[PDB]
Design a protein around this ligand. Structure first.
Ligand SMILES: [Zn+2]
Length: 46
């Protein structure tokens, strides 16, 4: 099951939704906001 190639060294930041990292705080400062809402839009949805 679990698996992961070699790498993924100490990462900078880490989102909460897409759990994505960011080299610079600026790129995240804006992204973080992008996660305003649009939640629970998977099942029984388009
Ligand atoms: Zn995100």
């Amino acid at each position: 099951g679990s698996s992961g190639s070699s790498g993924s060294g100490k990462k900078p930041y880490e989102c909460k939704e897409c759990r994505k990292t960011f080299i610079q705080i600026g790129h995240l400062n804006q992204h973080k906001r992008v996660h305003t809402g649009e939640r629970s839009s998977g099942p029984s949805s388009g």
